[PDB]
Design goal:
It is found in: Secreted. One of its GO terms (molecular function) is serine-type endopeptidase inhibitor activity. This is Serine protease inhibitor Kazal-type 4. With 60 residues, this protein is of the alpha+beta class. It has a single domain, classed as Wheat Germ Agglutinin (Isolectin 2), domain 1. 18% of the residues lie in helices and 15% in strands. It contains one helix and three strands. A three-stranded antiparallel beta sheet has the order 2-1-3. β1 and β2 form a beta hairpin. The radius of gyration is 11 Å and the shape is globular. The two termini are 15 Å apart.
């Protein structure tokens, strides 16, 4: 099932945050593609407007 047992990726741009401090941190999305940083997963989620969740930490 995975799905419910996901991590919700944190999706905003805090005031107090410049870069996604090159936080290298891969995850596997519910879409089933790897994203290289939870931030970038969220960024993609926002740009595309999707309900991606982290299925698990690290690559697919």
């Amino acid at each position: 099932e995975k799905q419910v047992f996901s991590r919700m990726p944190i999706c905003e741009h805090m005031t107090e945050s410049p870069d996604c401090s090159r936080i290298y941190d891969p995850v596997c999305g519910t879409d089933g593609v790897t994203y290289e940083s939870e931030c970038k997963l969220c960024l993609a989620r926002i740009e595309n407007k999707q309900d991606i969740q982290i299925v698990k930490d690290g690559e697919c």
